[PDB]
């Protein structure tokens, strides 16, 4: 089926979106007619779940299902933040360019969240999810967005264009907000998709409300140093 709505994980880490902006611009200085293929500033996201919401009631139902999903995602994470590392570049058959999600324990957790999301929405009467394997990625360009490119000889993304960013660490996004977004409505002023509703996973997010305080950071500093040593 053709989805018209999706659950979105927005990219809020400014380093990630700034790195992608650089990537997009470097491609454009090599070939400026790729301009309309680039995804818009402010639109960067990971798609968690696609669906069809076909009327006002169903849009309300989607919003209800998103709210109902919150405790489930909290259950799944078992008191740990979900960290999504974005590293390197890939394509879907040379037509869609994306920043890759790095391999790790987070991928299975993300998949679990996606499947629980699909179940939660379907149990509320919403056609959601797909039969194909969930392969999350962070899109930065799509040739289909610029139809005149075929019409003038550009029919695939030249792999040389993004060669320098092939092992570029864009940054890490911690899961917090999940948005219910319209694919077809007018985008927000800041470039992001039209949002019907949002939830926040985070507590926000800690096992304990009271400050440690900053005791955990030692964990973040160490884990990051170990990741860099690899």
């Amino acid at each position: 089926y053709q989805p018209n709505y999706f659950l979105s994980i927005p990219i809020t880490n400014k380093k990630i979106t700034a790195g992608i902006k650089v990537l997009q611009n470097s491609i454009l200085r090599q070939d400026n007619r790729l301009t309309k293929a680039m995804v818009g500033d402010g639109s960067f996201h990971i798609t968690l779940l696609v669906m069809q919401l076909l009327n006002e009631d169903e849009v309300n139902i989607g919003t209800d299902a998103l709210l109902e999903l919150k405790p489930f995602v909290e259950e799944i994470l078992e008191g740990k933040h979900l960290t999504l590392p974005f590293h390197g570049i890939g394509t879907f058959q040379g037509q869609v360019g994306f920043v890759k999600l790095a391999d790790g324990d987070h991928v299975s957790a993300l998949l679990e969240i996606a499947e629980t999301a699909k179940r939660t929405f379907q149990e509320k009467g919403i056609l959601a999810g797909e039969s194909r394997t969930f392969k999350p990625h962070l899109t930065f360009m799509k040739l289909s967005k610029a139809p005149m490119l075929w019409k003038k000889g550009v029919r695939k993304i030249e792999p040389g264009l993004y060669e320098q960013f092939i092992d570029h660490r864009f940054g890490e996004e911690i899961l917090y907000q999940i948005d219910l977004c319209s694919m077809l409505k007018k985008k927000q002023s800041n470039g992001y998709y039209h949002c019907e509703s949002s939830i926040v996973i985070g507590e926000k997010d800690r096992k304990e409300p009271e400050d440690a305080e900053l005791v955990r950071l030692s964990k973040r500093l160490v884990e990051n140093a170990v990741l860099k040593a690899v």
Partner: protein, 382 residues
């Protein structure tokens, strides 16, 4: 463990803000290395036991065996004491008393023979034997040498000899029923087996030598023959002296033998008095050797006084007799009689004579044609 290890360090860096990162790491990880207290030592001593038990009675019993003890106690038992035994006859070997016809030589020193006599004084068979027979008997005693451990006589065995000890020591043994007792010993003195000289009979005891010794032995047959022969010779001789005495001619053979049986003998040394004038006339004599002088002190011839000296009325010799008047009267002896040299007379008691043959006067009359003659002889002149 890597992230957690480095988190402890990093927490302390953030808290403590040390000026040097590396020196703080040396100190932190050195103290963490020091920190572990894991090693431990356990020593265990414990008492383990079972609290309760249940007891059931058992009927079994145990016994032990005492060491064997051996004891012997002398025992006397009498069965049915009776006093009823039948008595068997005994009999010695027969022998022709009357001397067959002259047809035993064992040397002996004076001391040995003298000692044999002493050893024999009290033995009844020897006790009252005359000088001659005793000599012939000792002559007949043969010597028997014995080595130590040897059995002279053994209880039960038949006996033939009588023994006198000459030298040595001996143990005497007597077996009564099943018991044998070492009852007594002999030490170079003694005699035994006298019974064997009478008849053959079982030895009543056993005699064993305990050293080298010597014994004088006498065989029954030899002993009996010596004695019988001699007494039968003496009898014949006595018989003759009675027979040749005319006063006794009317006597029968058996009557002379009764006299021979009891008549005595006496030896007188020259000069010794046989009959004393005045004492009581109890017997009469028959000279068998030597001579006898009959004296009378001529005083009993008147009324008070005279001679009072010595006068020989008669003088008798071998075969003659004197003291005859004691047979026919009862007045004191008329005269004295003295032995003229060595004399041997047969002496007969008058009272015994009468008890055996009755009064002499009757005998004198038996043969009436000689009564007068006899009377004149007895109360006559010469």
């Amino acid at each position: 463990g890597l992230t957690e290890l480095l988190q402890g360090y990093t927490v302390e860096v953030l808290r403590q803000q040390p000026p040097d990162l590396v020196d703080f790491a040396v100190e932190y990880f050195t103290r963490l290395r020091e920190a572990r207290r894991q090693e431990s030592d356990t020593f265990i001593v414990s008492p383990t036991t079972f609290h309760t038990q249940e007891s059931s009675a058992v009927p079994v019993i145990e016994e032990d065996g005492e060491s064997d003890s051996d004891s012997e106690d002398a025992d006397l038992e009498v069965p049915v004491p009776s006093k009823f035994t039948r008595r068997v006859s005994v009999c010695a070997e027969t022998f022709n008393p009357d001397e067959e016809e002259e047809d035993v030589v064992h040397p002996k020193t004076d001391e040995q023979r003298c000692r044999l006599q002493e050893a024999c004084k009290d033995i009844l068979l020897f006790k009252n034997l005359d000088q001659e027979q005793l000599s012939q008997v000792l002559d007949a005693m043969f010597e028997k040498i014995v080595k130590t451990d040897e059995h002279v006589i053994d209880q039960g065995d038949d006996g033939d000899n009588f023994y006198v000890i000459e030298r040595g020591t001996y143990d005497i043994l007597v077996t009564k029923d099943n018991q044998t007792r070492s009852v007594g010993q002999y030490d170079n003195r003694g005699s035994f087996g006298e019974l064997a000289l009478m008849y053959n009979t079982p030895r009543a005891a056993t005699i064993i030598a305990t050293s080298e010794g010597s014994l004088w032995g006498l065989d029954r047959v030899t002993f009996r023959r010596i004695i019988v022969k001699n007494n039968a010779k003496k009898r014949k001789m006595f018989e003759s002296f009675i027979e040749s005495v005319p006063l006794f001619k009317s006597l029968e053979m058996s009557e002379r033998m009764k006299i021979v049986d009891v008549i005595g003998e006496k030896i007188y040394k020259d000069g010794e008095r046989i009959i004393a004038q005045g004492e009581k006339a109890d017997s009469f004599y028959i000279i068998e050797s030597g001579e006898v002088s009959i004296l009378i002190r001529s005083k009993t011839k008147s009324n008070k006084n005279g001679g009072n000296q010595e006068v020989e009325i008669a003088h008798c010799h071998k075969g003659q007799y004197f003291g005859e008047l004691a047979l026919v009267t009862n007045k004191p002896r008329a005269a004295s009689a003295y032995a003229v040299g060595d004399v041997k007379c047969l002496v007969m008691d008058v009272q015994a004579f009468e008890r055996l043959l009755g009064p002499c006067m009757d005998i004198m009359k038996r043969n009436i044609s000689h009564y007068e003659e006899q009377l004149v002889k007895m109360f006559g002149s010469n």
